[PDB]
Design a protein around this ligand. Structure first.
Ligand SMILES: C[C@H](CNC(=O)c1ccc(S(N)(=O)=O)cc1)Cn1ccc2ccccc21
Ligand code: NA
Ligand SMILES: [Zn+2]
Length: 257
C-alpha cells in the first residue's frame, strides 16, 4: 500500500521496508562544490542504437517504458561501471508544479522532473538476481527543466491518454531513447538504492550534469495521469518523488573538471 500520499508516502516506507533508513539510500543532494573530479572515471558509453521498446505501463506510481532485455541490445558501460548493464525500462518522477519533481537535487535545487533509465548487470543473468547484488543495477538519471519542447519526448506524451489509470498498458514499439539524452554526458556518480520500495541497495547512480528541456505542455500531460485505477476516485499522478536522503559515508564523484 505504499505510495506518495500523507498516509503512505516516503515518511512511512520504513515500517514495511526498514532499509529505508539504510546506509546507501537514494536520492541524495549533490553538493557540487564538494563532489571531487575523479580523472580515473571513464566516459560513459551509452549504446542505444539497437534498443527495442515494447510497451508502456501505468503501474500506479509512474509509467514505465519497457524494453526487450533478452539480449545485449541497449547497454550502458564505461564510466564508473565494470562490465555491461542492459536497459530494462525507463520512467520519470515529477511534481505538481515546475519548482519540484526531481529526486536528486543539485546544491538543493529541485528540477521539474527526473528521468531514470534502469539497467541491470548482465553478469547476474536476470534482473531478479541482479537486485540481490550491491552492483546489480546502474540507473542513468537525467534532470528535466521546463523551457523548449523535447521532440524525442513527444511520442511518450501522446500515448499517455491511453494509459491514464493504474494497470493500463499500451504497445510502445520503436521508441528511440537516444532522443531523451542531453548533449553532454558529463556526470556525477555515487553508490545508492532504488528510490521506491523495496529500496534495495543495488544501484550505481550516474546523474547527468546537463538537464534536458521539455515544454510546459509536455509536463502538464504527465500531471494528467492518475495514481488510481479505472472507476476509482481520481488522484492525479503528481509529486511521485522521494526527497533527498542522508549521504552518510559516501562520496559523490564528478566525471568532469
Ligand atoms: C524491484 C522491482 C521493482 N522496482 C524496480 O524495478 C525499480 C527500478 C528502478 C527504480 S529507481 N526510481 O530507483 O530508478 C526503483 C524501482 C521488482 N522486482 C523484484 C525482483 C524482480 C523484479
Ligand atoms: Na566529496
Ligand atoms: Zn526512478
Amino acid at each position: 500500500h505504499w505510495g506518495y500520499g500523507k498516509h503512505n508516502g516516503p515518511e512511512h516506507w520504513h515500517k514495511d521496508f526498514p532499509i529505508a533508513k539504510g546506509e546507501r539510500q537514494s536520492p541524495v543532494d549533490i553538493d557540487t562544490h564538494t563532489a571531487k573530479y575523479d580523472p580515473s572515471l571513464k566516459p560513459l558509453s551509452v549504446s542505444y542504437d539497437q534498443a527495442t521498446s515494447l510497451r508502456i505501463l501505468n503501474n500506479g506510481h509512474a509509467f514505465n517504458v519497457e524494453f526487450d532485455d533478452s539480449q545485449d541490445k541497449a547497454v550502458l558501460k564505461g564510466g564508473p561501471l565494470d562490465g555491461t548493464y542492459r536497459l530494462i525500462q525507463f520512467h520519470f518522477h515529477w511534481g505538481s508544479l515546475d519548482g519540484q519533481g526531481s529526486e536528486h537535487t543539485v546544491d538543493k535545487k529541485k528540477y521539474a522532473a527526473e528521468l531514470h533509465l534502469v539497467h541491470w548487470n548482465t553478469k547476474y543473468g536476470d534482473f531478479g538476481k541482479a537486485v540481490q547484488q550491491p552492483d546489480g543495477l546502474a540507473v542513468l538519471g537525467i534532470f528535466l527543466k521546463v523551457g523548449s519542447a523535447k521532440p524525442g519526448l513527444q511520442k511518450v506524451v501522446d500515448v499517455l491518454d491511453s494509459i491514464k489509470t493504474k494497470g493500463k498498458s499500451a504497445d510502445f514499439t520503436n521508441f528511440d531513447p537516444r532522443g531523451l539524452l542531453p548533449e553532454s554526458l558529463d556526470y556525477w556518480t555515487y553508490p545508492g538504492s532504488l528510490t521506491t520500495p523495496p529500496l534495495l541497495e543495488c544501484v550505481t547512480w550516474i546523474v547527468l550534469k546537463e538537464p534536458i528541456s521539455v515544454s510546459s505542455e509536455q509536463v502538464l500531460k504527465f500531471r494528467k495521469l492518475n495514481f488510481n485505477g479505472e472507476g476509482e476516485p481520481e488522484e492525479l499522478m503528481v509529486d511521485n518523488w522521494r526527497p533527498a536522503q542522508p549521504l552518510k559515508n559516501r562520496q559523490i564523484k564528478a566525471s568532469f573538471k
